[PDB]
């Protein structure tokens, strides 16, 4: 951690902190869903990166050889410091973009320019053609990212899977992107400066609707990747218990989205005995929520084992020093997996649910944040997933 490196982390954080309060005061004291949706994607991304940085700190302190497990060069290079740094800069940009949108200083530049600008720079940074800005790391990411979407045609590895799972948790952004593209193209008034009140984005909210179920498909995209990948491994090993079963777990997503998806279109059409679908949806969802949970506590974290005479409900050997964290995680995971039950009850209670979706999404990423710790620990201790080492 070069002295200057630490200094940058503080400086970037400092600007970010004084600003994040600015926008809050701005709205309450100084003068809409499209904008909320459009910018929601960015936040999750930055928040995600920051939490991952914390994870890196953790895996180290404990002693997890994150390098060997993720099969990397001995120099990690991207230490927590550097990770907290990258997030800092993106944070500043996002904050500036959102704020600028609130106000309107230029008087010639249209508002719809700012949002795109925000994402444009992000794309470039990663694809920087020049050898600047952690060029060594940004390239690694780009390479593996490809392998992910080409898994049926690429041999599997831990990094190829880990990334896949993280993607599963971060899905709203994908969906958001879709909304952004669709928004402008249809019913967006390229003429009006504000461009935030066309058809009140209500009837024209078709972009977030399910006429083509575009959102439905994009929502399943995260799952498809892992699912096909799992079958690929099964083919690699010819036959397997751990694999096939795992694939099925992801498969439940398909049935769920499908029934729920059909549900909404039928309701719009006057139902014509569409009540039956509303039952299946909930039914399958329960199966989905439960299927994962059991896998998480047993297959993934590796808890509830016979050997631990010393520790109740936990494995024989633990590495995170306070036993309390493990117990807390188990309760938290259950609540997070079954979070939608709260949402469904509150749906009955104008733009309802929209807020519910928003509030739940940061928590979803936090669940993954907690999950990372344990999954890596298990991998280090027992080669728990299908054995890649040796």
UniProtKB/Swiss-Prot annotation:
GO terms for molecular function: efflux transmembrane transporter activity; inositol hexakisphosphate binding; phosphate transmembrane transporter activity; virus receptor activity. Changing residue 11 to G: Decreases phosphate efflux. The record marks 340 as: Gating residue for phosphate transport. Changing residue 340 to A/F/G/L/N/Y: Decreases phosphate efflux. Changing residue 387 to A: Increases phosphate efflux. Keywords: Cell membrane, Disease variant, Membrane, Phosphoprotein, Transmembrane, Transmembrane helix. It is a multi-pass membrane protein. Changing residue 368 to A: Decreases phosphate efflux. It catalyses: phosphate(in) = phosphate(out). GO terms for cellular component: plasma membrane. This is Solute carrier family 53 member 1. The chain holds residues 229 to 626 of 696 of the full protein.
């Amino acid at each position: 951690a070069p002295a200057w490196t630490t200094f940058r982390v503080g400086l970037f954080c400092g600007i970010f902190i004084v600003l994040n309060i600015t926008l809050v005061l701005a709205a309450v004291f100084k003068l809409i869903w499209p904008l909320i949706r459009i910018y929601r994607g960015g936040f999750l991304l930055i928040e995600f990166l920051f939490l991952l940085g914390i994870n890196t700190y953790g895996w180290r302190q404990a002693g997890v050889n994150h390098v060997l497990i993720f099969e990397l060069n001995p120099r990690s290079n991207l230490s927590h410091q550097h990770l907290f740094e990258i997030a800092g800069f993106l944070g500043i940009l996002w904050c500036l973009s959102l704020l600028a949108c609130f106000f309107a200083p230029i008087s010639v530049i249209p508002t719809y320019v700012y949002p795109l600008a925000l994402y444009g720079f992000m794309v470039f940074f990663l694809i920087n053609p020049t050898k600047t800005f952690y060029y060594k790391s940004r390239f690694w990411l780009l390479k593996l990212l490809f392998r992910v979407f080409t898994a049926p045609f690429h041999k599997v590895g831990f990094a190829d899977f880990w990334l896949a799972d993280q993607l599963n948790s971060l899905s709203v952004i994908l969906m958001d992107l879709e909304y952004m593209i669709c928004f402008y193209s249809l019913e967006l008034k390229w003429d009006e400066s504000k461009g935030l009140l066309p058809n009140n984005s209500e009837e024209s909210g078709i972009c977030h609707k399910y006429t083509y179920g575009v959102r439905a498909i994009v929502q399943c995209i995260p799952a498809w990747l892992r699912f096909i990948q799992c079958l690929r491994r099964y083919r690699d090993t010819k036959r397997a218990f751990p694999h096939l079963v795992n694939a099925g777990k992801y498969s439940t997503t398909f049935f769920m989205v499908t029934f729920a998806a059909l549900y909404s279109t039928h309701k719009e059409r006057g139902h014509s005995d569409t009540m039956v679908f509303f039952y299946l949806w909930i039914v399958f969802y329960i199966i989905s929520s439960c299927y994962t949970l059991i896998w998480d506590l047993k297959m993934d974290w590796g808890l509830f084992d016979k050997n631990a005479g010393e520790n109740t409900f936990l494995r024989e050997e633990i590495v995170y020093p306070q036993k309390a964290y493990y117990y807390c995680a188990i309760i938290e995971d259950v609540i997070l997996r079954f979070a939608w039950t709260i949402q469904i009850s509150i749906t009955s209670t104008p733009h309802s649910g929209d807020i519910i979706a928003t509030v739940f999404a940061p928590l979803e990423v936090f669940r993954r944040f907690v999950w990372n710790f344990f999954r890596l620990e298990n991998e280090h201790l027992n080669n728990c997933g299908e054995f890649r080492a040796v």
